[PDB]
Amino acid sequence: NHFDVISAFIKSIRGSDPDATLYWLANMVEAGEDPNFIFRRLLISACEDIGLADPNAIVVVQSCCDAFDRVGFPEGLFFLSQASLYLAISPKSNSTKSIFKAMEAIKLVPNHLKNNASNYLNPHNYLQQEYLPTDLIKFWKPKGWEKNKY
Amino acid sequence: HFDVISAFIKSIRGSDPDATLYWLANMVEAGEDPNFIFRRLLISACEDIGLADPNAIVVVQSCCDAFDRVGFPEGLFFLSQASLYLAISPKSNSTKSIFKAMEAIKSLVPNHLKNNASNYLNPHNYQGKWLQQEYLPTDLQGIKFWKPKGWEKNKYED
Amino acid sequence: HFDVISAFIKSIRGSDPDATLYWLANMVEAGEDPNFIFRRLLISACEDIGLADPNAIVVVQSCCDAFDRVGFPEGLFFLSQASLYLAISPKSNSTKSIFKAMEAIKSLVPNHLKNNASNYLNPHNYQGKWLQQEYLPTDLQGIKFWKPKGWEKNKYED
Amino acid sequence: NHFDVISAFIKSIRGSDPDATLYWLANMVEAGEDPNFIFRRLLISACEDIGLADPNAIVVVQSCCDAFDRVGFPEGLFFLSQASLYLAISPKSNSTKSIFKAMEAIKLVPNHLKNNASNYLNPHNYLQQEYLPTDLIKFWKPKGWEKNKY
Known part of the structure; x- marks a missing residue:
């Protein structure tokens, strides 16, 4: 009750x-x-x-x-x-609770995203490149500051 | 001193x-x-x-x-x-406001505002522009404890 | 992992x-x-x-x-x-710059830049618009380690 | 030398x-x-x-x-x-070093500035009122953000 x-x-x-x-x-x-x-x-x-x-x-x-x-x-x-x-x-x-949608889906790393990957393209050096696995989709749902960033 | x-x-x-x-x-x-x-x-x-x-x-x-x-x-x-x-x-x-509300206290929780209330609606699920829902007890709705005078102005105006 | x-x-x-x-x-x-x-x-x-x-x-x-x-x-x-x-x-x-300067290092302090230097001039005392004073060793003046690309832009432009 | x-x-x-x-x-x-x-x-x-x-x-x-x-x-x-x-x-x-000019001068509180002073005018309730002693003068020397505040 409190x-x-x-x-x-x-x-x-x-x-x-x-x-x-x-x-x-x-x-x-x-x-x-x-x-x-x-x-x-x-x-x-x-x-x-x-x-x-x-x-x-x-x-x-x-x-x-x-x-x-x-x-x-x-x-x-x-x-x-x-x-x-x-x-x-x-x-x-x-929108910070979007993490739970992602934990639901979770329940293998593409090669270009592996540590010291040989065919990673660094965005600072420059972009089309895939950050999700192949078999995967939008987890983050923006609704203030995040509006401008979006 | x-x-x-x-x-x-x-x-x-x-x-x-x-x-x-x-x-x-x-x-x-x-x-x-x-x-x-x-x-x-x-x-x-x-x-x-x-x-x-x-x-x-x-x-x-x-x-x-x-x-x-x-x-x-x-x-x-x-x-x-x-x-x-x-x-x-x-x-x-404007943070001195809390003393005003403290004077109003010196008070049951509305049902829809209780922990796990089944009739509570969540502003984050709300497909409209403003969720009209009571946050104060009914005998107190409309009462005003805070008014801004800088940053509080802008936030208020929204 | x-x-x-x-x-x-x-x-x-x-x-x-x-x-x-x-x-x-x-x-x-x-x-x-x-x-x-x-x-x-x-x-x-x-x-x-x-x-x-x-x-x-x-x-x-x-x-x-x-x-x-x-x-x-x-x-x-x-x-x-x-x-x-x-x-x-x-x-x-742009903070990766430090590695560039580190490569230039891999170097005596100019006199006017030493601790308590008697010939040092302080930008805070300066009645002009920009105090022209050497901060790098002479054989290196003009060399550029940092360039910005956001907030760094504005700060740079000033 | 370091x-x-x-x-x-x-x-x-x-x-x-x-x-x-x-x-x-x-x-x-x-x-x-x-x-x-x-x-x-x-x-x-x-x-x-x-x-x-x-x-x-x-x-x-x-x-x-x-x-x-x-x-x-x-x-x-x-x-x-x-x-x-x-x-x-x-x-x-x-301008934060302005504190030293003030410490030089230092080297009695007006009544209206005393704790629970009866004739203090609170600026929130409203302003001419004196914050230095009578016998005293500008200590703070602004030179960015402090420009706008000034």
């Missing part, structure tokens, strides 16, 4: 609602919830829910955890609030 | 790099613990700059780490970089 | 996110050490992306730190973020 | 010369110079020579040291080269 509050909190972040985020956040801290337990979920969210929409999201959130470590309560509340608000208002993407 | 550190943070909050430097210099002559100064700088990076530039906490944290690796005398420049950086950043106190 | 990791780095170098993911997935099914994968990702962030985006090393390092804090199963997403991020970044091998 | 090489290396960075930087860099590593000794000077340079011209310079350089730690030679050479090139081509400023 799993229910942190769930409401993370779904609020995922839904881009900074008000509900703070509300569930305040709920957890009036309840004396463990801050490392909040931070671990923020980190995961920074990569599972924001991810390549803003690839510096994990950087900001880690700085907020480190800062919290040095500082603790009552002041640390600001790190919790910045990191929570920061994820709530960021653009969203779950 | 606690007045000097106060004048330091207020000069930063007031966007005064010169006074910022003067109270920093005061503090180190007087033997103040650099870890203590870095605590207040980390705090002020979220409390006084905050989402006006959420990179501020990364830069200051990295100044703090640089100081742990180098120590004095050269550590004095990382105190100075961190301090100057906050003094000249745009300011916002 | 060393062929799989090779195909992984080459897919990243080739800007292929799909193949990148497939060889990542291959590696973790096979039990590959995540620290080993992160080493190659840190390396590739400087060798293959490099000054095309010097933030790449910060992001990947931070993925690595996130993995140390979280471990599996959720650590798999930080491997994935780091990997995908390099696959889609602009590429540059 | 102090002479690292000096040539740092002055080359300070002079914005990426070629000479690499040259002295290669010199230090063919000599088996200690990489922590190179990195410590890069860090200092990232703040004393680049500083607020690019305030993420210390971030990049620290990531390059951490990466080097995990990896070592021969591959680590890339972290050394990226961080060295990165500082060489960055815009330059020594």
